[PDB]
């Protein structure tokens, strides 16, 4: 109970042996009474404080160790614990930055409903101040309006908590998005076209592009394959829906 | 989301997360309605000592979903925790569905009683027996016979007249029910054989 | 078969004398006079000594039907 | 007596539907009698 709150987690915690200490922390201190009521009991208020502190520590450890299951579990625990907003407690500090990182990676998971509903929970936290949390908002805004390379340069800096790996995971989502955008109705894709202008100057990305998806490389050029056809139409599903109408007003 | 606390490989963490689900069941619906996957994981994790009450809150999840029959089945698989409380409206709904299921199964297994019966679940028979027994022992025999006849048990009328015969006109009341109301002889034979053996 | 099947229904449905006039709202008025005749006879059979008050009211128009 | 009430409501739905079904049959029958006349 109330043991080594941040005894070894503040300076540096790179070892894997700290997982056992965290597990013991969960068994003893995190499971003291509850996190739900938070009516009075400033002791439980400090229990919520240490719960949020160990959650952010786990978030930093997970984003540095690249473990999707553990990271997602810490994200959901962070959301459920923060579900209890108490205004008298000192907000900010840990709030805006972590929420920005969580939302940014959630957009890398392709979820926008949670992003915007959190933005509505934060009327002035996102627009008036806290570059810590509007950095993902600006990145999404640019990545929706007009920018690919400008997004990359914008991603070059994270003001929230450094930890410049959410920019790389968004870079992995935009290589997928760019690959889809060029698998779209484009007319032709030169090899230098795919390699130079957008990103990925002759990395293993180039081999991934040349081997995974279609549009086989011609002479220094990928070309669109058979996707638009005259389609001499057998016209059988129009017959089925016609029969569906027939049976619909063949009765009652 | 609290589902992570159940997603951790710590049984104590799972238990802590799943205590208060039966208390937040009334207020929170959407978060519990979307968490069907998590409770399925807990139900599959039968090596954890809270399998029974995890199936209970699984039935609570299906209460949120609206699948009362599936929630009945989950609390059925839990077994002894089907009958945690005997007085609630969700309890009345699930017992009414289970009585309907028992009535249908009894009718079909009496119409084809030469073996090969659909397996009368020990867990379902146990809760059914408990429910109409207490409905007989509540000492309201103007409705105890009525719910008994709805339950459609072959021996239930015999049990009702062998127990405390409150309002001894219930004999004539069930007499006119079997004379006029129950007339489809194929499943009427249970009420008829009890009626002839007593009268 | 039409006249028969609209007259020999009160034998089964006299257990529901209130439903004798309900199941004949179209039979007693049908374009087939034999169907109307059967409907009439069906209510008469199913209500032997009952003051139904509804079969009588529905049979009153048929007491003066143009078909003999 | 609650399943009683549910069966009665289903009874009411059937009766309400059967009203216009009977009436539609009667009036179409009258139409066929008129054209035969």
């Amino acid at each position: 109970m109330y043991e080594q709150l941040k005894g070894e987690w503040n300076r540096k915690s790179p070892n894997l042996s700290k997982c056992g200490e965290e597990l013991g922390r969960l068994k003893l201190v995190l499971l003291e009474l509850n996190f739900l009521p938070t009516t009075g009991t400033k002791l439980t208020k400090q229990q919520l404080i240490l719960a949020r502190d160990i959650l952010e520590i786990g978030a930093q450890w997970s984003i540095l160790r690249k473990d999707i299951p553990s990271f997602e579990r810490y994200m959901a625990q962070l959301k459920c614990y923060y579900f209890d907003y108490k205004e008298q407690l000192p907000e900010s500090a840990y709030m805006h930055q972590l929420l920005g990182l969580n939302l940014l990676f959630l957009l890398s998971q392709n979820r926008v409903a949670e992003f915007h509903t959190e933005l509505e929970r934060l009327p002035a936290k996102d627009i008036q101040t806290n570059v810590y949390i509007k950095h993902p908002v600006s990145l999404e805004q640019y990545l929706m309006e007009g920018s690919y390379n400008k997004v990359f340069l914008a991603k070059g800096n994270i003001p929230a908590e450094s930890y410049t790996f959410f920019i790389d995971i968004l870079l992995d989502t935009i290589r997928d998005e760019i690959a889809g955008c060029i698998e779209k109705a484009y007319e032709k894709i030169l090899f230098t076209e795919a390699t130079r202008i957008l990103f990925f100057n002759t990395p293993k990305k180039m081999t991934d592009y040349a081997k995974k998806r279609g549009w086989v490389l011609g002479p220094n050029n990928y070309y669109s394959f058979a996707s638009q056809q005259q389609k001499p139409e057998d016209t059988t599903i129009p017959s089925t829906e016609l029969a569906k109408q027939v049976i619909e007003y063949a009765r009652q | 989301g609290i589902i992570s606390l159940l997603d951790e490989d710590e049984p104590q963490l799972k238990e802590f997360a799943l205590h208060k689900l039966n208390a937040v069941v009334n207020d929170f619906w959407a978060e519990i309605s979307e968490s069907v996957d998590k409770i399925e994981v807990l139900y599959e994790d039968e090596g954890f000592r809270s399998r029974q009450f995890a199936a209970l809150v699984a039935s609570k999840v299906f209460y949120h979903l609206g699948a009362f029959e599936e929630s009945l089945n989950y609390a059925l698989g839990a077994g002894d925790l089907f009958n945690v409380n005997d007085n609630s409206e969700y309890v009345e709904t699930i017992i009414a569905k289970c009585i309907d299921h028992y009535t249908k199964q009894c009718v079909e297994n009496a119409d084809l009683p030469e073996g090969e019966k659909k397996p009368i679940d020990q867990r379902l028979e146990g809760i059914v027996n408990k429910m109409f027994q207490r409905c007989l022992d509540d000492h309201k025999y103007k409705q105890a016979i009525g719910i008994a006849l709805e339950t459609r048990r072959l021996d239930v009328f015999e049990k009702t007249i062998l127990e405390s015969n409150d309002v001894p006109g219930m004999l004539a009341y069930s007499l006119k029910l079997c004379m006029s109301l129950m007339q489809n002889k194929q499943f009427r034979n249970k009420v008829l054989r009890v009626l002839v053996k007593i009268y | 078969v039409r006249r028969a099947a609209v007259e020999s229904l009160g034998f089964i449905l006299f257990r529901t004398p209130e439903q004798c006039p309900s199941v004949v709202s179209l039979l007693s008025e049908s374009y087939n006079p034999h169907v109307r005749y059967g409907a009439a006879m069906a209510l008469g059979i199913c209500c032997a000594g009952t003051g139904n008050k509804e079969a009588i009211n529905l049979l009153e128009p048929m007491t003066n039907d143009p078909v003999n | 007596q609650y399943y009683l009430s549910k069966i009665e409501e289903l009874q009411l739905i059937v009766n309400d539907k059967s009203q216009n079904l009977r009436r539609l049959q009667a009036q179409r029958n009258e139409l066929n009698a008129k054209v035969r006349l």
Binding site: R251, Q252 | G146, L149, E150, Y173, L177, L181, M182 | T16, Q19, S22, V23, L26 | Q1, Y3, L4, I7, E8, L10, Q11, V14, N15, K17, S18, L21, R22, L24, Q25
Partner: peptide, 25 residues
């Protein structure tokens, strides 16, 4: 009492609805 009374009444009315509906065609 009223239980099977309305059960039988439902069975008969639900039947006569469909049967008289059979004449719409």
């Amino acid at each position: 009492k009223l239980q099977q009374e309305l059960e039988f009444l439902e069975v008969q009315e639900e039947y006569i609805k469909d049967e008289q509906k059979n004449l719409k065609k």
